[PDB]
Amino acid sequence: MKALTARQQEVFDLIRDHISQTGMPPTRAEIAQRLGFRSPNAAEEHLKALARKGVIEIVSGASRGIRLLQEE
């Protein structure tokens, strides 16, 4: 249906893993630090590619604010 590339699928798996442990979605600092990104704008660009294909809503304003929608 809508296929995800390997490093954007690592960003999507950290969103599902923090909801399964805590209830809530992660910050853009947790996505850059826990997966291992040298520039935090590369973690933000893979998060934008997940919203542009159609799998998440980025709630722009809330720090822990990424709502899980679709995969397939």
In sequence order, which residues have a C-beta less than 8 Å from that of residue 63 and are 6 or more positions away?
27
Could you tell me the CATH number of the domain that includes residue 39? 1.10.10.10
**Alpha carbon 25 to chain centroid, angstroms:** 8
Method of elucidation: NMR
Q: How many CA atoms lie within 13 A of 63 on its CB side?
A: 2
66: three-class secondary structure by DSSP: strand
Residue 9's closest CA among 37, 56, 50, 45? 50
The DSSP line for 15-43 is HHHHHHHHSSPPPHHHHHHHHT-SSHHHH
CB atoms near residue 31 (< 10 Å): 23
Q: Looking at the 3D structure of the chain, how many domains does it have?
A: 1
- The domain in which residue 32 lies consists of 1-72
